[model samples]
Target: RDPQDDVYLDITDRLCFAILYSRPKSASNVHYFSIDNELEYENFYADFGPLNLAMVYRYCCKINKKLKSITMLRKKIVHFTGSDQRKQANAAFLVGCYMVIYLGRTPEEAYRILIFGETSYIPFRDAAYGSCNFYITLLDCFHAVKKAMQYGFLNFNSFNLDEYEHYEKAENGDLNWIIPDRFIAFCGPHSRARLESGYHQHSPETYIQYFKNHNVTTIIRLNKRMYDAKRFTDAGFDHHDLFFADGSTPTDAIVKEFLDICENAEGAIAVHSKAGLGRTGTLIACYIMKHYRMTAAETIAWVRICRPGSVIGPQQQFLVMKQTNLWLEGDYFRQKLK
Candidate 1:
């Protein structure tokens, strides 16, 4: 009955192992790596031997590619950009490609859904790292890949972020602001990364103030280490604040916290990272599939395509899958199915 029985135990062990072994190198590309550790494997089994049976039953479920026709695929591109239109447009193009591949569509088909914020230009464009032609160049690559894959056409639209500027107007205005014809439109506090320790120069209240002033409805805090639920709650923010915690955070705790937030419909969920990939994608993907009705494999494929470098790593992927599987097998999904 304890959710963290065998399922959580096995997943946690493997996940911890994966994270420990997969240091700086494993981060580069998880698509092409081997999880071959005879001793560790043996020890894993020896310690958590009960998992063998549970895992066997899990595998028997045949949790493989069951692509639920593109009809059910709901895709969204949430970005952090600065003041360069070209760079912003460039990022938009890459978003377009990911939308195409994941949604089972093509670049030409994807809509130009722009979710802009206070700024007008793109971020990191003129920085030392310099900007790579992300928008236009990525579109070309996406087109090439689309041709190779033979997908359908995507419809594009640009939902100006500036529209959500007036807080009072937004609350009364069309709720359609968040709804995406093919994608959802969203914008957040202007920062590359979430407010962290050294970054806390801006008080927790300062960040929340922006959302409050903007009339924002969903704040996804992706970095678990940066912020805590108590701090936000104490600062006048309510449980409705959607906290998108990292995979490193305890799974049950995060779910419990999210469930509390989902109970109400207010503010935005914060999904941030150094780059918004890796842990961010994992947490968001799990939240989407588990709470938003996406299948496990479907969600994984979507996140993988949306953020190319994202692999979910073996450990994190398995943890997310297990959580999804548990939710699916529970009465929650069963009730919804009816």
Candidate 2:
């Protein structure tokens, strides 16, 4: 029989998450790890470290709430009260994390059981119509737990309470360390000062002020139609039209134009295409390789760390293939965003 939608027995739902995630003696009832309340959710969110699994929950899990494209649903937050799919998918990730960190399930075991097992909750039938499932959020969940293990946020080999205890001293400690040690070792330190990838800001008035507040000066659009540049241009932001098809890379000329525009720009650039992870990440990864002297692995890792759900499909491999070429013509100089 298929996994039931409404009930996920692995996790004791909202009432008392203590049965699943243990908290310290100092933490009051409000700061426990449960999903029912926002304060409880904050504690649950912070414990996972800088993986930003919250974005995975926001974008992928609650996708059913807004039937429109995900780009349009970027800034909106849908409640977790009544959505069955959201409940299951959210629980899938939480269960994945719990199995790895709290329980002693190996990465291989957790992956198979939650995603691909006969009793899997987030089932992906490879050959059938169900191939379109948003399995990446499930993968994101597993990856966050694996990284927590690797980065010493928590350990499954031996559950160390000190790590959890240690996490409490600082306020949102992992916020500063979004790029994990593995990527940090590979690429040194990085910043998101220059460019950001996102969905098309359909209402320039909406995010125009938001972008201005964030010091963004240019809107380099990647997707065509959907919207026009007039509003952004009218708002005094230098709008460059570098239209490329969704899920594909830009042409050499387009890349050259992008480089020229970005290099000469006074302030930061905000890039967008479709849902703003795949194509947007592809171009930004290329920019990293060309401008920052980073390899495909580090660039992709770095970008994904900055903006979750990036460089999807074959774009990652494409960046690897283009890395050598980018490095050949690229500069070795790196500078601070400030």
Candidate 3:
């Protein structure tokens, strides 16, 4: 059976026309589109009703079926170039549209991940308005779809049964996945708000309140910034900033400082970076080694499950192993000399 039979034939025809006839305006090389504002959303809906738009969603899912991995898919979407730009742009637009329509993701979330591969929570409006090329390409697909639907060439009766099953549901939880241990809580950056929020999502005072709720009196920030440290300090929590860039191994002094704080800390400690995945994971792994006397492999094995999506880069993993080995050697030397 034809795929169009699953969706409305007319709807499919309209989508095809949109994809085929969409062109970048003169003096513009970009060729993708996104919905940034309510006006745009209303415009998109006016041009293509829910039925026709659902067809666009179906087209994205079909395109996605051929791709094996997000990495490859991301590369294809990002590396738009001459001769291949149109194909790349089409795929990117479809995938992004699918995310917004099916996955319950906002336009910014879809655009950030699809266009730049940024996993961090940067504000969608900032990225959308700041990047001119990105904004043009993002609006281009929508404009095309609007044009295609306005022509009123496609007709459809209903959606397919399988269309509902194609989308993966959004995961339920706080955006910052926090995993608590006995004395150490590992998590992503948690403050008043996020990259997108104009005001703190949580109160600036909320960090201290959360620490009190969790019996956490100390905060260890591994981000190479003093911002978190200052925030925590103003809120009356004992905060330490061990400045280390992502992918860089912590120094002996840094390690010693962390251990000293842990040893003397009066209550639970919180460790985090921007995403709390890489640098934060590495530091936590080192602490496990020094406290539990576990090898790097063993510590990482445990921490990996404790904090899902932890210790992202190979460089960070290597640092954990190296720190563990150094700690072992130091312990051995003290034992031998004594």
Candidate 4:
């Protein structure tokens, strides 16, 4: 009854869409990749794993096809859903037909529906990775695989209960989930990576994995130097740069652009300046000012908690200066620095 218990008992259309980005035709594409095999399921990692699942799901949907497109799917979250309510329209639960109708597998459709029909929220893009450090859990993934096979979504290739395996965990360099899970400060939610473990864990793969794991959609870099934005762009992030001097603040025009991205971004925006403390922290706090209704001083105080050593000298003053003007009709800065 802990975290892992928060599993989706059934396979829905939206989840199937997320898992399958491409449509493959035959069972050969699945079995050929060794993805359909239960033992091979553990080998998939990050979005790579999700894609293979999609490969299997989509191939099977046509034998596999997601019921709705993304645009229509998004509308359900807005008009149909609310604070305590989730929209109930898409019932594209297909694991029942997938196992039985196609493969002629075990587990009755009625029983499979009983387990899979149990509802759980599945947004087009949302995942919060907290426990088990930063490494994406094979267990969280494989657990679902086990359920699918048990209930007959996948073929029974070694689907044995009580033989659960313990997966290996590794050290991570770039960390996340500290920056409100949506907007990220470049420096970090945790730079604790700079401490002990050396380069193997600090590679580009490490950083990209964190971004992907944290659901990063856009990465806005302000420093203009050092780490190339290419790394992020190459990985398909909406990477952009607003180069500025080390100690100075960006022009109002530049600040407005950054603020604009925060409002409209589909997922988390990983914003940063060189040190991540100065410009990055200041800009992030500027966002907090209006959206969360915190004044300059109050905003800085909380940001420090979010990422310590934030808001450097003049940067702090700038945050206080721009408080009222930032976002959200947010206007402050009348208070004397008492």
Using TM-score as the measure, the top candidate is: 2
Better of 1 and 3 by lDDT: 3
Q: Mind sharing the TM-score for model 2?
A: 0.45
Better of 2 and 3 by lDDT: 2
Query: What does the lDDT read for residue 198 in candidate 4?
Result: 48
lDDT minimum window of 10 residues, candidate 1: 8-17
Report the lDDT tens digits of candidate 1 across residue range 1-338.
22121110011111111111112232221211111221011211111111111121122121112122242133211122223233334334333444554445555544322222221223211111222221213333344335424322112233232433332122321111222221112222232333455342233454466545655444445453444556556655552333443324335666556545543545455444433444455555555555545444444334433333332334244544466564673448558669
- Candidates 2 and 4 compared: the better one by TM-score is 2
- Model 1 regions more than 4 Å off: 1-155, 161-206, 213-231, 239-250, 263-267, 271-277, 295-312, 323-338
Q: State TM-scores per candidate.
A: 0.36, 0.45, 0.41, 0.43
Tell me the tens digit of each residue's lDDT in model 3 across 1-338.
22221111111111211122233222132222322111111111111111123335455555345244443343222111112233334444555555554355555665565544321111111011112111124433333233222333111233332422221111111122122323443333444444243422232344455467767778877875525457677766788778788656678788778877876787777776665556776676666566545555444433432333445445344654475466785587458769
Q: Candidate 2: where is the Cα deviation over 4 Å?
A: 1-50, 53-202, 332-338
Taken over the whole model, the C-alpha lDDT of each candidate is 0.35, 0.47, 0.44, 0.44
For residues 1-338, write the lDDT of model 4, one tens digit per residue. 23333223323323231122133223321211212322122221111122223223443443332234443333211111111111111121223334443444443442344245353433111111221112212222233333434434344243222211100122432222224457666442223234354432233345677678768898887875555566667898898777667767778887778777777788988876654656777677776666655566545544432344455656655766776676445433223222
lDDT of 2 by residue, 251-334 (tens): 788877877787777776777665555666777767667765666665554454344456655565577788888887674333
Model 3 residue 129 CA deviation (Å) reads 27
In model 2, what are the clashing residue pairs, if there are any?
none
Measured on C-alpha atoms, candidate 1 has an lDDT of 0.35
Error of 3 at 251 (Å): 1.6
